[PDB]
Amino acid sequence: SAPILIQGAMDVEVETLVAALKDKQELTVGSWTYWQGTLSGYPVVVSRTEVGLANAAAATTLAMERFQPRLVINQGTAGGHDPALHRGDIVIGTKSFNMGAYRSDLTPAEQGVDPSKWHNFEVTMRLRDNGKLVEHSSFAGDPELVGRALGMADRYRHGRVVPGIIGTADEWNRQVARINWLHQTYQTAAEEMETSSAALVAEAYKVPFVGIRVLSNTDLHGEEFDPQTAIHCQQFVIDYAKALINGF
Amino acid sequence: SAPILIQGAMDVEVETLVAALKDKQELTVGSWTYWQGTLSGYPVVVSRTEVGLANAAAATTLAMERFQPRLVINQGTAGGHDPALHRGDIVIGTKSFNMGAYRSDLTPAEQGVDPSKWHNFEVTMRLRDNGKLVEHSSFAGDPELVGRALGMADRYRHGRVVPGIIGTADEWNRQVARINWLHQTYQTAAEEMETSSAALVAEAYKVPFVGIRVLSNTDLHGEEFDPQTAIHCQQFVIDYAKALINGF
């Protein structure tokens, strides 16, 4: 009875999921729409989160309060950070983190601006549990959920399914030198704008979480946005959810 | 009666507020704690949001769902961006925005990294209203709430009270050239890590919102963190809330 929550930011990242639901009921609260239905006879809630960290955290929190899901799959599109990956490849998030969180040391105006000196600002991922502070430098994908997606790699026929680190920021980077620096510094597979924020809320509520992201683009190979990748990602995630459901 | 919601991120930014409440009870869900009580006999909820955009959005959303407040005051400490301002001055947020949101045009690796080319990525503040996309390049503080705070300026005993733009980011900037660039580009009064995120959720729920921030520090004048500013801000906010309550 507790539903599986499946998230996407954009319309193109959720409409295939929504079409797969049986006996759909729609709910909109604030800026956030949910479709409550079934897959393989089991309750599933699809959430259109809108874009970015604030939207992701709001949409996830609202879903926790309204639906009490048993697990969360956050999915959608991303941009490549690892040169080994191409448009259409899918990253299963071994961990996600707030890549956009920056703290910098004091420098006078004369020294200019140097982002290579900025440090990851981990307080942005700090939480409390029963009122006690718990530090986080990243959020691990639930390792069984991660393993399951990797084991199903053969069922995805539009690229490779690989484990990787998902870097979350309110950013779309197209300065290739910046992408390279972020990859070298944080070992990122891909960048996007929601995962670690949804993951933060899932950790606060102690609900298993996994991020699943297709590269819709990568400037490391001159590969521009292809909307079909979002559809292919949802097809894989439907299969994945159905497998989980067969298991329940 | 629908409560006034008053927010602060850190313990030092809420303990004075909490001490002011009568007939309290303390509620924690996930990572977020709320104190429900009364000020001047009127219901008030004090929220400890924890730090950063994801936490602010989660804490605000959770408060909307649990308490349905009639208005939101987000307050706490900030770092100066405007050279005219000093530690202890209070900024009333005429608007707040996601200063950390960055989009850049394509540049090849050989051109390196140039943050002066990172433009504000407005999609991070885009919402939906009854299913329809609504752009936001910032969130205006409720203008009557803003005006009221400005009208009470001479009731603040420890510095100026000024209107200004609040720049929200998962960042603590201490590169003075970077502070200067953000101020020149966005006309920011001060920087902090929650306001526009809480504001985004308040806009989605159509609940009046105002940000009230004291400068606890500014590297434009070599003024390091002073925790007493946080206490002073809360005293001003209590006075302000009591004024609204008298009005109800």
Ligand SMILES: Nc1ncnc2c1ncn2[C@@H]1O[C@H](CSCC[C@H](N)C(=O)O)[C@@H](O)[C@H]1O
């Ligand atoms: N290269 C990239 N960098 C950052 N986010 C990316 C990305 N590629 C895809 N994304 C994801 O896709 C969305 C991009 S922002 C949305 C842009 C789109 N034109 C619109 O108006 O809706 C975000 O949800 C983000 O998580």
Ligand SMILES: Nc1ncnc2c1ncn2[C@@H]1O[C@H](CSCC[C@H](N)C(=O)O)[C@@H](O)[C@H]1O
């Ligand atoms: N100069 C500044 N830049 C960004 N945020 C600032 C700031 N000065 C104060 N803040 C605010 O104060 C908090 C700083 S991060 C918290 C740091 C503190 N040492 C701790 O561990 O709890 C954030 O909530 C932020 O909104």
